[PDB]
User: Fold this.
Amino acid sequence: SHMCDAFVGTWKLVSSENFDDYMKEVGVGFATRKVAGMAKPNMIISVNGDVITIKSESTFKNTEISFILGQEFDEVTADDRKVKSTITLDGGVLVHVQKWDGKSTTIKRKREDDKLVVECVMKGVTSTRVYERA
Ligand SMILES: C[C@H]1[C@H]2C[C@@H]([C@@H]1C(=O)O)[C@@H]1C(c3ccc(Cl)cc3)=NO[C@H]21
Assistant:
């Protein structure tokens, strides 16, 4: 057993708060915000050795990242930003920092009860997205 065991699995979005405002702060345009905000993604997390894979699948977009903790990688986000990403484990929380155009956002994934809670922060704006097992 290991590092991310309690994250592995297939998760479905069940609630969201402040996500439109978060996306505005990030710079996402109107039409993408509307369509992305309607999506109810499945988040599929798996581990093979040191490599973690996170897939996000929805009617809007399918994304996939694979990474090693602490090791920067280039990512194309669902809104087509070209970012440089680093994901670490900090006290049992997966902390994902995205850097682009002198900007930064941080996405935290934590296990809380039977949920996987996501907190997305861009300057002063936080969005909370709650996922349950599918
Ligand atoms: C786990 C969350 C994280 C990643 C994705 C996901 C989610 O719940 O979809 C979402 C996101 C994002 C940004 C722009 C667009 Cl257009 C769509 C998603 N930024 O942060 C959150």
Residues 30-38 form the longest helix (9 residues). The first strand starts at residue 9 and ends at 17. The beta strands are 9-17, 42-48, 51-57, 62-67, 73-76, 82-90, 93-100, 103-112, 115-122, 125-133. Residues 13, 23, 28, 32, 36, 41, 43, 56, 77-79, 107, 118, 120, 129 surround W9Q (CB under 6 Å).
